Design a protein around this ligand. Sequence first.
Ligand SMILES: CNC(=O)c1cnc(C)s1
Ligand SMILES: [Cl-]
Ligand SMILES: [Mg+2]
Ligand SMILES: [Mg+2]
Ligand SMILES: [Mg+2]
Ligand SMILES: [Mg+2]
Lengths: 194, 194
Amino acid sequence: KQYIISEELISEGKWVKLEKTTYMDPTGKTRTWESVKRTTRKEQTADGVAVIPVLQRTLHYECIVLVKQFRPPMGGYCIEFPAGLIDDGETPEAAALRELEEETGYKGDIAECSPAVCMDPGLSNCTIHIVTVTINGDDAENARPKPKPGDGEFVEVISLPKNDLLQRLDALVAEEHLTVDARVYSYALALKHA
Amino acid sequence: KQYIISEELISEGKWVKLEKTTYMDPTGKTRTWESVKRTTRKQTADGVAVIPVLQRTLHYECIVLVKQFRPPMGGYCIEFPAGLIDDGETPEAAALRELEEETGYKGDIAECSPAVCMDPGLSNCTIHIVTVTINGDDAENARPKPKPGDGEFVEVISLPKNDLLQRLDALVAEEHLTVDARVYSYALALKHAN
Ligand SMILES: CNC(=O)c1cnc(C)s1
Ligand SMILES: [Cl-]
Ligand SMILES: [Mg+2]
Ligand SMILES: [Mg+2]
Ligand SMILES: [Mg+2]
Ligand SMILES: [Mg+2]
């Protein structure tokens, strides 16, 4: 029933733009919306990847590997799945494994890759692939993981046990000023609910 | 170590604005970021998203989701019921209200997250994730009345909790919809648990 009629640029930065979207509603009436888009999406199937990294080690409980960084939009520190934008020509899987190594030091193994999923669809067209990766923490490659941050990347690694993830996140939020990401929280809530 | 120095308005719509954020990197170098914010916040968070667990005896437990056209996406998305929190509304009340408006179901609060970020590399947007149970055997949820506001057009899709991720992939394959990242993350963790 519904579709886009026109997309009028309001303001274009180097990374993000704002558009006036005109669309047809299902009564047959024309309406508008304010839409955010990135300027960096070329032929990628999504803007970015977020990695769900399951750290597996003999005689350890499985951990979920998370990262903590300063996020200028939020004006503060956030706890997130490792993530980054997909480089031109790069596959989502390759982007995931690369970002996971850059942000955490770990070399993972692909498990699964989602279709493109929407970040905040009432606001933006932004999409990611959610890529589940296992990390063999018994491998020597992953014994001394050194994050290789790119320019302006400053990332702390936080590994939390899967079997207590929500409470461990709660305990971090209780101790400092820091926001947990909605996908991380959602994943932690389902681990509780299962 | 990191903090905001200043924020310069680039462009302000009725609902969304774009800013150029100046911040201090951990080395003492000053850097800029393009940030999006909503113009609507007052509140604990911009919005709520509801995880609605429909419980009917002798049936599988379902998670109630909504399908709507999303102008920034140019398409239909599958999402947790959700909306912005009204000035002077609590997140719990916003959650029960939105759930009723979007689905017609009347639920009970199970738990409420702290404010969690939507896409912290892009925006300051936050929500509370509110887990709600729905007694599907109660008379008031027999023939649920969805009460849309002006210009809302929402379809309800109930999916079994125990097979959520496979049911979502199926919808994506057959119906060319985009699943929401928080929905997909929750679905993943239901499979990954134990
Ligand atoms: C790296 N510098 C930037 O200004 C941005 C990157 N991603 C954005 C949404 S803004
Ligand atoms: Cl529950
Ligand atoms: Mg990143
Ligand atoms: Mg990165
Ligand atoms: Mg809504
Ligand atoms: Mg509503």
